[PDB]
């Protein structure tokens, strides 16, 4: 019995196998003609889920015993500090494993080769302090607001026929957001059709729930109540405490993130108050920043321990469907985007695309710098790294040389998803980068190579800094160790 | 053919096999570029222990039918007076069994052959008076403290590329562990993230827990409170006879009673100046709101083992009921704080008045094998404390071993009779050490043996194996040295351990499946 | 689904296997640490035979059903046109087949893949002018006379402990030989003599034969007679074959020394030196025979007696005798001198070279990587496979050295990309070193012929679409 | 067919197994106390053959695929010149391979290991006179010629009571064998008969053939004719040239034609049908030779001795005798003996004897027997591993321990425990006393000079060089016998 | 011709529908080009006989029953 018991060639292999399975899956996802996947599980799961984003799908399920879940976990921190771009970092880490094949030819000590990872730290610093960046971005900016990185995230999605316009909208959202603190208060939902604009911008948070059939149709000078919490005669007292406190405030709406007792429900309708059952917590937190918030506790909650925004809360209909809109936020820090869309199922993919937009833009505004997208950055660095291996001494250099060829796979994945032959694309791509043009990259729409800058496609500066360091450290854990697993059972 | 039945001569082979099997695992460990082994066992074992110290692992488990357990036990006697540097005693002993093949060739007394062993002594002691030692080791001492043997003990270990720096750190710990205490309370913990320093030295004990997000971040002039019983309340022991109360609302006083429990805790606490509370169990929620406003840091479900070590550090405490604060408690007062240590968040207790309990913090990288820093340090601790006491050392890198081998070769056929084959067997044993040092480095062992033999023969004691070089170099500048008593005891111990097992033969069973 | 038919992937595999099977056995042979193998055959073969050099063994028999015999025949033409060196050309051709697995990845028409060969002309020019060449080989040469290619040829052999000194010596031999006149005429033998020098250059051709116990010891103003058919002041008679007994009595009284069963190879070169012979029937003596008359005698080099021909009037060719420190290693020099001389003859004629120790191979590899990307779609993938082939050569040189191959690849590339053509692989060092200090250089000609020879062998698989049969039953 | 798969450590194992089986069977053979062995083969092998001589049995059968046939074959050439005595060369070569187990422990390269042979260069020279071979064997020798080593060859054999004398005779044969005509001129057949001497020495070659029932009984002032081409106008040409010469005997190495046969009987000339070639070559040196070709061959091209040729009965199995050779350089010995097992052992002994002694007269060098040479060499080689640079050091020390087994095997077959023997033996040789060696009869050590046991110098040079060559080749290659190259 | 098949179909159709008969697939180019410059012109009859024979064979075939296939032989 025991646990693990691995040594020799077999031990290397378990790590090696995990990398290959994940790389093919994520490979489809990258670039303009990315592949959407629907997941079917009948193991304490109810329906097929479709996730374009590679990071979200890896996080959701830990299918088996081999190590890979922890490597996957790290990518999420990256998403909040810079966002998704297109998933590429996981693939590069995996290809590090493949040259281990030439390593059995070493037949002596693999550990000496490990010196390359230390070398990698020198290399990571070589791109972060080198080729990238842009000149401009003074805060807000009339035209430099976007027409950039949002577009590269979009270009990976087909909807960029009318959708590139949607992307333009997203930075209006970031300019309003900045101010007081990070990224959190933004909510996005896609509608089913009817617009050339394909989108609308809302003043406040958008919600979709009802108390019940009975209750007032509409409210005015609405005041908002949020609760963290949901002898027989004493039951009446709960009814009465709620009514007594309620009437003075003029309470127009109540929002609760959970199940709600039947007695109060009745009362709200006669009073002229609309309540919400099991309101999503995420919606509530966004709403709190917007309304000035409150402190959620016991029935002592109504009055000045509560802050209510006073413009207008009503259930309204747009084009055809009926939704409930919270509007008139003094804060301005948090707003909501409602996409009417040009009635197509591509529109149903608007939710897919805007979510990607949400993480990318917040980071883009505070990083204050960017890189050239479309794989422009990867080929340039690849030409340069071939030289780098030759500068170092033979023990360090061999590991460094392998790292350099890793960048080669990205050009193929970007073009292959485009639909143009991958083999042809690599040759022409390398030649333009070699000349010295940073701007030049892969034009997926063309199927060849072109000027990335005209497109407006740029990558956040931060995505490049974090991934280079992360790839090396994860790799080190695997090769230096031939026997591992973890503590506790039996 | 076709069966495992064994008797007399075939029987000898099982004894033979045990010595060869042990040598392969141990050889990787023997020097400046060792590997790292984990070993997980199912059935009455607590977690898999990954050990870089060869002596520790052989003693712990009697794995199988072949007999080698008895040979293993003796190495500990060497440990009691030293037992470390790099593990090499067991390896040489194994080589002795290979010649047993020609022992049948010499047809006579197996035990008279054993008399050769009481010439091993006149070989083992030969290493004594062999190799000038060093002439050093005072008290505390500014530069002779390290950048020596600890580096060699750790040279074998994987972490050597950056860890030789932390190895250097370990002597500072021995400096504060000398004299006035003996050996106690040394606790070392590694962290997942990396820093160039790869280690911080803390003036006291290191723990990992936090009260909650709220509470003052740092405390000063700290008082320590340890409780045998939880902060939880209700039943007590005597129920209270199951309370009545008339209409309902009055019962709110019961709610108020809970407040009183908070009250006693704060009233007694403020006078003492309480900065930190450590409890080895579940903690009731009410006191935390109190602790946060007061400015006191408490620890929920603190581990008991940390507490016992800590008590020696603080001066101890008597743990009882809420009377526990004031005089019955004896908390120390320098600094208790939660310190960002490059990556993870850790809580550090430090500035102990006693000064006899101390902690060293090591980093690493993030791996199951990382936990070998746990045991790398354990031999690092032992090597340095001895280095202070011995004040004597030998040239490392196998310099001592090659010199001795040349001298033993001379003895060979010169001593007539039965003892002649036995004495010569011992002599070629020394040859493997030079081979092993280079093999791990990344250079060809065969070539290394060739060049090394010529330099020692010439008469230069200082010259040895330089792994970074790939060839032979001056060992003294490198700083690699071996403690002096390790050499006197190791050779004696190796011979005696070898004698019992060779003298004991095979495993006995009768039929195939 | 009945009997032996193959399509696409399965048909390809038989071609694939033939190249791989030869490579494992031949790879061992390469390097100072090379190995010699013994083989026993099924038909009309008497016993196990052991051949040190790859070319001799490959040539004798075409055994197996898979195609590979045709590839083998090419190496001998190369040997005649330059020589054995150390066998390595066969290994380079085999490696090109490995890339075919990723070839399927390009996923379309294998035949236009062939247009990559068209691109190989580009690769061929690459092996040209963007390499070290000579930069020095003026005539005689103070330091670079040798310590080079002969040493590398030498290295694969065990004897290179004192032998490397002998190899250096062999260039002195080449300088006198030098010129367009009759390449060959170099013979060397070992002698059970004394230490260190391990070899002495001398006066003339050396031959180990005697007429018989009766006959004069020395001849002056010697006349040389060579006859194709078996049995003037005639001093010496040399015949390449059996000699009839009756004349033997006659020769002793006359004052003439004859040689029975003299080797033909010694004879042909001797003729250029003397001035030629028309070897016919007994009409052969006089003008139809051209003789040289300085001195023919059997002398002891250092102890043992052998026969020396010297004072050639023509002056076109000369011979190095050597000596040595008693062993099989010593007469190995016999094989090595002849090998060292031939490489040099090409070197004088071409007046161009390169740097040895794999210095030439790494530099070219860095440059060829660029070429694949530059060429269009289909051309690019086939062209690059050829380029990666060069990477293995550095590895094979180092692997046989007993030194770490992984470490070696990195450092080798490191010295070459810098722009210093002198740096290369030093096996004796175990790392990388200055090839020029060693003095190793390769002839310019050896690199062009090897490139042409390897390319054609590869195409036998591709120029003909199919070779066997399908389903009779 | 170029494809037999064994990989990694497997290539060594095929080679390793062939040597191990042969060594235990051959080890009991060596020394005065040697063992006789019998073997069975089926499929045209009638019964069990017993061969005292290890070399003879190895040549006869190729039992299985594991490599050993080539190693085995190179014993006969050794035997033809010096070779035999006691078979030890195969035993020593086999033990070299056992250290290959240590080679895996080396963990790097078998070829750099091949520096042992470099070591052999120093070891070969080191032991080729620092052990003090012998200073006698002048050439011819009145009686140091034998009553020594030949007796030792016979010691392992029962025949040593009446056949010890037979052994003495072989050296006389050797003296005539001196010269550059080294390979040929030895023929011995045992004859059934009686006499204490048990042998008769002929002044010429002994053959066993007859023309036919018809033909002259005896030829005097004989002329000898040898023809390369068979006898198969032709009748008359042969008589016409035959008559003038006076031709007394014709020897042909092949089939003879019937027409001449009638003519020879009337003529007075004795002819031999299908005479073996080996006898003929020996005869040419003896008679001054002749140029054998077509029927033109007669007169001057033919030289013929004329002392006497006749067909007679020794006592059993009729033979034809050639005698009175003018040259005197070559002669032939016939052994009679008094019938038993011991007598047929005579055939065994001079096959072994002439070759041992032939080199002994020519070499002028021999070594002390009984293991004396081996122990002294062993002490000397201990110094050597240190003397060489280093790679060549580990390689030297491994070669050195091999010599230790030879003392052990002689003692082992002597009926005494070798441990005491090894220990006591080394001290004597180390001291520097060359004459002292292993005395099996004694059970300890003694002066073998008194015994008269000496080994030829050649047996020691050929064994060390052959062991070197027949080891490097076997370890190196994994493709053994099936079909031709690559 | 070694060139990627899907890309090829796209460029090919746009040029032919364009109205230029001369333009066609250029295998050496790996794209489309002027066939006439190459000098390539299929005999007209080869195109009509193939189409007509296939047509008549088809008439009998999806109006019968007994058959199958293996290969030419």
From Swiss-Prot, chain C:
Keyword field contains Protein biosynthesis: no
Compartments it resides in: Cytoplasm
Molecular function GO terms recorded: ATP binding; ATP hydrolysis activity; ATP-dependent protein folding chaperone; ubiquitin protein ligase binding; unfolded protein binding
Biological process annotations from GO: binding of sperm to zona pellucida; chaperone mediated protein folding independent of cofactor; chaperone-mediated protein complex assembly; positive regulation of telomerase RNA localization to Cajal body; positive regulation of telomere maintenance via telomerase; protein folding; protein stabilization; scaRNA localization to Cajal body
EC number: 3.6.1.-
List of residues binding ATP: 31, 85-87, 442, 447
Modified residues (Phosphoserine): 47
Catalytic activity: ATP + H2O = ADP + phosphate + H(+)
Modified residues (N6-acetyllysine): 141, 168
UniProt KW keywords: Acetylation, ATP-binding, Chaperone, Cytoplasm, Hydrolase, Isopeptide bond, Magnesium, Metal-binding, Nucleotide-binding, Phosphoprotein, Ubl conjugation
Top-rank taxon, per record: Eukaryota
Binding site for ADP: 31, 85-88, 155-156, 357, 442, 447
InterPro entries, per database record: Chap_CCT_beta, Chaperone_TCP-1, Chaperonin_TCP-1_CS, Cpn60/GroEL/TCP-1, GroEL-like_apical_dom_sf, GROEL-like_equatorial_sf, TCP-1-like_intermed_sf, TCP-1_chaperonin
CDD domains with a match to the protein in the record: TCP1_beta (cd03336)
Top enzyme category: hydrolase
Binding annotation for Mg(2+): 84
Assembly information from the UniProt record: Component of the chaperonin-containing T-complex (TRiC), a hexadecamer composed of two identical back-to-back stacked rings enclosing a protein folding chamber. Each ring is made up of eight different subunits: TCP1/CCT1, CCT2, CCT3, CCT4, CCT5, CCT6A/CCT6, CCT7, CCT8. Interacts with PACRG. Interacts with FLCN. Interacts with DLEC1. Interacts with SVEP1.
Function noted in UniProt: Component of the chaperonin-containing T-complex (TRiC), a molecular chaperone complex that assists the folding of actin, tubulin and other proteins upon ATP hydrolysis. The TRiC complex mediates the folding of WRAP53/TCAB1, thereby regulating telomere maintenance. As part of the TRiC complex may play a role in the assembly of BBSome, a complex involved in ciliogenesis regulating transports vesicles to the cilia.
Record protein name field: T-complex protein 1 subunit beta
Native source organism of the sequence: Bos taurus (Bovine)
């Amino acid at each position: 019995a025991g646990a693990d018991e691995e040594r020799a060639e077999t031990a290397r292999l378990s790590s090696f196998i995990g990398a290959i399975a994940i790389g093919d899956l994520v490979k489809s996802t990258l670039g303009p003609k990315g592949m959407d996947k629907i997941l079917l599980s009948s193991g304490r799961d109810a329906s097929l889920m479709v996730t374009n984003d590679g990071a979200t799908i890896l996080k959701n399920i830990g299918v088996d015993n081999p190590a890979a879940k922890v490597l996957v976990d790290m990518s999420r921190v990256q998403d909040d500090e810079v966002g998704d771009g297109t998933t590429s970092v996981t693939v590069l880490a995996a290809e590090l494993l493949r040259e281990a094949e030439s390593l059995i030819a070493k037949k002596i000590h693999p550990q000496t080769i490990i010196a390359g990872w230390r070398e990698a730290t020198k290399a990571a610093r070589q791109a972060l302090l080198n080729s990238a960046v842009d000149h401009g971005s003074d805060e807000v900016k009339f035209r430099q607001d976007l027409m950039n990185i949002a577009g590269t995230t979009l270009s990976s999605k087909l909807l960029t026929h009318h959708k590139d316009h949607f992307t333009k909208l997203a930075v209006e959202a970031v300019l309003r957001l900045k101010g007081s603190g990070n990224l959190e208060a933004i909510h996005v939902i896609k509608k089913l059709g009817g617009s050339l604009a394909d989108s609308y911008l809302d003043e406040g948070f958008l919600l979709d729930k009802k108390i019940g059939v009975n209750q007032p149709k509409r409210i005015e000078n609405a005041k908002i109540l949020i609760a963290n919490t949901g002898i027989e005669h004493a039951e009446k007292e709960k009814m009465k405490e709620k009514v007594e406190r309620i009437l003075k405030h003029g309470i127009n709406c109540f929002i609760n993130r959970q199940l709600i007792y039947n007695y109060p429900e009745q009362l709200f309708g006669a009073a002229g108050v609309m309540a919400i059952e099991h309101a999503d917590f995420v919606g509530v937190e966004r709403l709190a920043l917007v309304t000035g918030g409150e402190i959620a506790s016991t029935f002592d909650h109504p009055e000045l321990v509560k802050l209510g925004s006073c413009k207008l809360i009503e259930e309204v209909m747009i084009g055809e469907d009926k939704l409930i809109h919270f509007s008139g936020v003094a804060l301005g820090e948090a707003c909501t985007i409602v996409l009417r869309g040009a009635t197509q199922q591509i529109l149903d993919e608007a939710e897919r695309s805007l979510h990607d937009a949400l993480c990318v833009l917040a980071q883009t505004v505070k990083d204050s710098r960017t890189v050239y997208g479309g794989g422009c950055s990867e080929m340039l660095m690849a030409h340069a790294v071939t030289q780098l291996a030759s500068r170092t001494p033979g023990k360090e250099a061999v590991a460094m040389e392998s790292y350099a060829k890793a960048l080669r796979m990205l050009p193929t994945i970007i073009a292959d998803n485009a639909g143009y032959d991958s083999a042809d694309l690599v040759a022409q791509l390398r030649a333009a980068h070699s000349e010295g043009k940073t701007t030049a990259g892969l034009d997926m729409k063309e199927g060849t190579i072109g000027d990335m800058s005209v497109l407006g496609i740029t990558e956040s500066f931060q995505v490049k800094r974090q991934v280079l360091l992360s790839a090396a450290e994860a790799a080190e854990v695997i090769l230096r160790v031939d026997n591992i697993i973890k503590a506790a059972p039996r």
